[PDB]
Amino acid sequence: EVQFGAYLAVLLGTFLPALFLVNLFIQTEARKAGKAGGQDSD
Amino acid sequence: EVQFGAYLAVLLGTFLPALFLVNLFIQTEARKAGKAGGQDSD
Amino acid sequence: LNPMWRQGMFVMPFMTRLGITDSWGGWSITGESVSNPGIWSFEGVALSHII
Amino acid sequence: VSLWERFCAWITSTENRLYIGWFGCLMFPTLLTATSCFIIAFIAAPPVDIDGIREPVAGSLLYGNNIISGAVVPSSNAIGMHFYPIWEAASIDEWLYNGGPYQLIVLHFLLGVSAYMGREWELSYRLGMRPWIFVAFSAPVAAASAVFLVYPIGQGSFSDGMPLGISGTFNFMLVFQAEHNILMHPFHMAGVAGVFGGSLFSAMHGSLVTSSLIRETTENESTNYGYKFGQEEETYNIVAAHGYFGRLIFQYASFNNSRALHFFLALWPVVGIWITSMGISTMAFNLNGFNFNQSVVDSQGRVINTWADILNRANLGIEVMHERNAHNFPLDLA
Amino acid sequence: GAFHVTGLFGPGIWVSDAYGITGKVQPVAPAWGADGFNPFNPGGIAAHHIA
Amino acid sequence: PRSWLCCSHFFLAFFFLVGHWWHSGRARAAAAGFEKGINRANEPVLSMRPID
Amino acid sequence: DKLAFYDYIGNNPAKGGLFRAGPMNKGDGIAEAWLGHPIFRDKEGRELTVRRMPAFFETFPVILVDKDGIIRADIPFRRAESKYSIEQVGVTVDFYGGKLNGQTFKDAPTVKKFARKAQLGEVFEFDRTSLESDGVFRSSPRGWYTYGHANFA
Amino acid sequence: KSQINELSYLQVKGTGLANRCAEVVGEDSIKPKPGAKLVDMCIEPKAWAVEEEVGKAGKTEKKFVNSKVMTRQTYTLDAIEGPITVDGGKITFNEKEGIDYAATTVQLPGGERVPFLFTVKDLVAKGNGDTFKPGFQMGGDFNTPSYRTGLFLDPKGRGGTTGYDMAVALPALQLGEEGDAELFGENNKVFDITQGRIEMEVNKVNAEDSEIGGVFVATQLSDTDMGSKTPKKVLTKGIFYAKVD
Amino acid sequence: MEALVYTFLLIGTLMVIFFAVFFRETPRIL
Amino acid sequence: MLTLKILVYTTVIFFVSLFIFGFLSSDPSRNPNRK
Amino acid sequence: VIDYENIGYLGGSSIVDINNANVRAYLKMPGMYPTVAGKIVSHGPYSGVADLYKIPGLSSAEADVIKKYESRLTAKTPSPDYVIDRINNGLYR
Amino acid sequence: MTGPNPNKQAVELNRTSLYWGLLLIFVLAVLFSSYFFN
Amino acid sequence: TEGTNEWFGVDDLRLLAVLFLGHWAILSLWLGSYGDSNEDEDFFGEIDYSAR
Ligand code: CLA
Ligand code: CLA
Ligand code: CLA
Ligand code: CLA
Ligand SMILES: CC(C)=CCC/C(C)=C/CC/C(C)=C/CC/C(C)=C/CC/C(C)=C/CC/C(C)=C/CC/C(C)=C/CC/C(C)=C/CC/C(C)=C/CC1=CC(=O)C(C)=C(C)C1=O
Ligand SMILES: CCCCCCCCCCCCCCCC(=O)OC[C@H](COP(=O)(O)OC[C@@H](O)CO)OC(=O)CCCCCCCCCCCCCCC
Ligand SMILES: CC1=C(/C=C/C(C)=C/C=C/C(C)=C/C=C/C=C(C)/C=C/C=C(C)/C=C/C2=C(C)CCCC2(C)C)C(C)(C)CCC1
Ligand code: OEX
Ligand SMILES: [Fe+2]
């Protein structure tokens, strides 16, 4: 018998902070593509 | 008695698609701040 | 009295439809025992769709 | 022009993504077979008779374990030191019962790590480097071959070898304490000083470089962006960090030479782990650590206890309980 | 249809009786007539993928 | 006396395997010329492909 | 019943674990009543007190000690060469108060069951089916507050 | 045989020969003497079968599926002694000493591992007639002891004659009037003795060499780990060999 | 049901090791 | 089981022979100094 | 067994069992270990102290030390897990 | 590698379409939760 | 049969033809370049840079 609140602990302990760190990378590459002025800035 | 796989259905059915739609907005504002060239482009 | 369609097996009746009855555990869906199923058993198909 | 010369030119090319080399000809087939068998034996593998008493010890995830308790179990006491491949097992079910995949993983591991070590030499030859990074990697190769190879040899069985897991590691360390008294042995003492010293001089060198960095950035951006890659200017005032540590302890205890400084960082751990891995090796052949039990007596002759006698009663607790069914005779000769 | 199903170079289709008691993987020879379009005839499956 | 011989000649026989590693790393590189270090004028890595 | 409820090792905050979760009622269940105070007497008639478990020991051997410290009875691990078993000494249990108020059990199967649960402080009747109580002790909010606010600090 | 006795020890070891019973040559009759005592009876089974619920076409009657042995070459009995007493109607045998147990473990379809002690302890054989013949056929009951002697410690540390008697890392189970009586069966370790019925059949005799040998069939019951599970009926077959003296 | 989470954590860890080796930000001089 | 065994001695002395005849292939001369 | 009666008659009550005691239990009787104690432990179930004289291969001296301690010897119900480990139960000083 | 792809584009999502897509997910989460918990 | 004292673990005769065709199949590759060279050409170096 395992604790059924541990699935919510682990799978949100993975996904919520890991999806956070993806966002800081995507907006980093968007600012670099934003300044660069070619074909992707818009 | 409820199904204990429904917590994983709902709380990932909320968070995973809703955190997706946040990312498309943050990189949208980063491209607009990327082209604008002032104090935030870098 | 407990076939594979009672146990909610979904893709497993599609392996046994085209000719897979044995498994590496030694059991079979036809009930006859087997010494060696070789490569193409239930575990061999599942592991080869991964590779 | 020939087919072999066009193959030697590719296999020794530094223009590959990963350098393969001639040691990679027997690094990559060995370590991919140690890997691909480890992932299967850690996830899905039936229980294993380790004590040879036909009491199978579960070690995989499908048989109710986790990351901590799950482990690739060592081979049987019934096999012992005998070579047990798949073709000398008459079925795979007889192979997996008697501790099959422990020998397949370990023997393809020690060949692949001793080939990963020679591969670090080879690329240093083809790049113009001075060669001896692979001598620093000899220290974990000495320690990997001590607990997987040398200790099963001197104890005469792979069942005393180290279980490939996390809880199996601490079953290995505690049983090794009761039977060999490693903490009193001066070679575990010389490598605790190797990694306490190693983590000291790591964080002591890494702080004095980061302390004396030169202004190249603003306070908004990161500290690390003041280093452009491949630049020829020195990125920290080494005279500054020498004058700091020259006052923090005293003047003459400080390396002004950065080459002799960066050599002492490689000396201290590696010598500490060479010596330690020859502690397991000399304790594989039952040359145990110190034994100061009943060493202090009064003039009447009664035993006065010491801290080693309290340490002995912790060793007696593990000795009378390890392999609680495997023994039949009063002395653990194995 | 020529090799996997008809058992020339294959195991064949899981067939069964009319009432789901007996069933086994066996080669199925094709039925070419109008009986091939009886969909409960397993010979029509072999005749289809060959034709 | 078995445990003194199996723990001392075994002890040395690893360090002489380290002597095969030191003295052949130097001797193969002393034959090739770069045992004293990399030349500043001619670095071999700079005359290679892009890194990937 | 409240005063004897503090005399119970499951209410000690130094008995719980870290990664076990939930209230202390998840430990063994909601307490119902006080079973009473067992008093152990041998065939000689002297009073034997069960040696109590300290907070360190997860497991502790059941030992019955008289008034001066002499080991008089126990429950032996090794049953072969047994010299202080309950069968030899003939320890009878007498309850006083609680719902077992005047009762006396004399045979070795029943006395061993109450000698094991008497090293855990007082003796209670629990209800372990309401919260699916597994059977290991948790910690009080005294224990958790000391955990956070000293790892924070 | 005597052909096995020709070899030295270094030629037999590692070859799997010492596991295998001898092959007796020829057929004739031999008469047991008054003081006749059986000397080198070895029994080795060549096939194993466990009674299970088999998956036929529509029915689930109990049948024997076979199994693969997983303990390697440790199944043969050896050196079994005993006097051959002559009752008037039927010649009898009662074994006395020798290695008369060989623990082994077979694996079923599905991955289930069934250990069983294979034994001939306290065997009372009875066969038709007096003299050993190629048509001779004796058998009888033997007592199977338990697979584990009572001082075996399970993973929690509980045995029949030693160890604890409660769930040692579950200290809140013995709380209340009921105690831990819900898991009572896994605390009480009961030594179990069952019965087994072997049926031997002599078919090839030497009288000039006084050694017999033929085919047997033995059925017994597998182990239960002192009441942990329901034991299962195990059938086996093989060949034996004996020196009648 | 419980071991399915452990397997997903392990092979999910080996994914980001794969992407870090082959899709690494390649450092460039100038 | 004697069919697998044949397959291993192929694979071992394939790569062992690539190792043995790798360093016999004028391997000291493959340096960045000259040739 | 959780609740086994006659634990005392095994080794420590100074009135020994016959068909359940270890051979170490007869060490406390001077004269019987190892010869006379070796025959008692080796043979099968006994029903009384009178069955000790039925042992095949007894002398008058072997019956003598049994005659001394026949008040201390007594026979109980053979529980078959104790009857196996009568030569050696894995207890060593 | 080969050259840079001339089919690189950029993805946009204004602040308006964020609140549509958030409210779309939460209302589908309100609606379908009661059935999933059963 | 594990503990038999047989050369290289060659139990059956078929395993030899595996060994001989493994060393020779790469030997013949090796002789395609380093074979059929002059076996009488020396050097007073520590290391030879003769040819391919
Ligand atoms: C190429 C790298 C490599 C190496 C070194 C090994 C090595 C090994 N494997 Mg492995 N294996 C590999 C790749 C490799 N494997 C691959 C790619 C696979 C996937 C197919 C496998 C699959 C595999 C399985 C499934 C098993 C092994 C096993 C083994 C072990 C014994 C196999 C054996 O009999 O070797 C054959 C070796 C020889 C015949 C010796 C060759 C050495 C030559 C002759 C050099 C010696 C020079 C000589 C002394 C010079 C003499 C000169 C004279 C004048 C005196 C051994 C540790 C077995 C094992 O570990 O079980 C415990 C086992 O069951 N392997
Ligand atoms: C303060 C406490 C303390 C400290 C600091 C140490 C320190 C040490 N102990 Mg020790 N010990 C202690 C208490 C302590 N001990 C106590 C209390 C006991 C009694 C229970 C012991 C019993 C004990 C034993 C029994 C052993 C040690 C050992 C060691 C050494 C471990 C170093 C090591 O193995 O790395 C060396 C590195 C390796 C072994 C790893 C090799 C890995 C290879 C190179 C590559 C693997 C790659 C991997 C698979 C994949 C890479 C990533 C991938 C994604 C690419 C070190 C000196 C070990 C020792 O003596 O050295 C062997 C040992 O066996 N100790
Ligand atoms: C030797 C000659 C031969 C034989 C015996 C067969 C035998 C068969 N063929 Mg085949 N076939 C052959 C030659 C042959 N084929 C050749 C030469 C071709 C040309 C390449 C085809 C093309 C063909 C097709 C395209 C189909 C068959 C099908 C069939 C099966 C018919 C029985 C059945 O289940 O259909 C059941 C009958 C139908 C499903 C009728 C299809 C009409 C559709 C479903 C109407 C609805 C359409 C609409 C979009 C649905 C939504 C509306 C909704 C409101 C209802 C049977 C296995 C059918 C099949 O595989 O089904 C299992 C099928 O769909 N055959
Ligand atoms: C100072 C902080 C603090 C303290 C002492 C407590 C104390 C308590 N809470 Mg509580 N709680 C807090 C903050 C706190 N809470 C906050 C901020 C929240 C909102 C999220 C909650 C929400 C909450 C709920 C919903 C419940 C409690 C409950 C409880 C009780 C039992 C908890 C237990 O067994 O721990 C369990 C032990 C642990 C969780 C381990 C501690 C953390 C370890 C050390 C890991 C640390 C994190 C790690 C480093 C990161 C891993 C990341 C990885 C997964 C990616 C206990 C009285 C339960 C109760 O009985 O209430 C009736 C209950 O139902 N609390
Ligand atoms: C008058 C009266 C009242 C009477 C009473 C008498 C009286 C007054 C008594 C009082 C006297 C009293 C006790 C005073 C004595 C003071 C005293 C010494 C007390 C302290 C006590 C004590 C135990 C001290 C000893 C401990 C001590 C400090 C040991 C030092 C350890 C030591 C030598 C370490 C050296 C290690 C080392 C080699 C480090 C360098 C390697 C390393 C990687 C460093 C990093 C690094 C180094 C560089 O160099 C540079 C360049 C860079 C880049 C860099 O990364
Ligand atoms: C396995 C991996 C799982 C993948 C899941 C990840 C994807 C999940 C999310 C994607 C869908 C997002 C929808 C975004 C929504 C979105 O961004 O809208 C904007 C979008 C188009 O907008 P435009 O073309 O203006 O977009 C301009 C661009 O700059 C931005 O899109 O509209 C639609 O596509 C159709 C309208 C749907 C809008 C929802 C209308 C319904 C309203 C809500 C009803 C609920 C209230 C009901 C009350 C009763
Ligand atoms: C919890 C739960 C569950 C489960 C679920 C699951 C299990 C899920 C999973 C899912 C998954 C797991 C999914 C996945 C998906 C993915 C995707 C969608 C991906 C994509 C990809 C991509 C994006 C790619 C990319 C690329 C690369 C990488 C390279 C090259 C280029 C390209 C582009 C191609 C269920 C319902 C049962 C029940 C209830 C609860
Ligand atoms: O196997 Mn693993 O641990 Ca080395 O000591 Mn002897 O053997 Mn067994 O006992 Mn203790
Ligand atoms: Fe540095």
From TrEMBL, chain H:
Disulfide bonds join C21-C42. It comes from the Eukaryota. It is found in: Membrane. The keyword Thylakoid applies. One of its GO terms (biological process) is photosystem II assembly. Keywords: Membrane, Photosynthesis, Photosystem II, Signal, Thylakoid. GO terms for cellular component: photosystem II. Belongs to the PsbO family. This is Extrinsic protein in photosystem II. The chain holds residues 62 to 306 of 307 of the full protein.
Automatic annotation (TrEMBL), chain K:
One of its GO terms (biological process) is photosystem II stabilization. One of its GO terms (cellular component) is photosystem II. Its main location: membrane. Keywords: Membrane, Signal, Thylakoid. It is found in: Membrane. It is a peripheral membrane protein. It comes from the Eukaryota. The keyword Nucleotide-binding does not apply. The keyword Magnesium does not apply. Belongs to the PsbU family. This is Photosystem II 12 kDa extrinsic protein. It comes from Chaetoceros neogracilis.
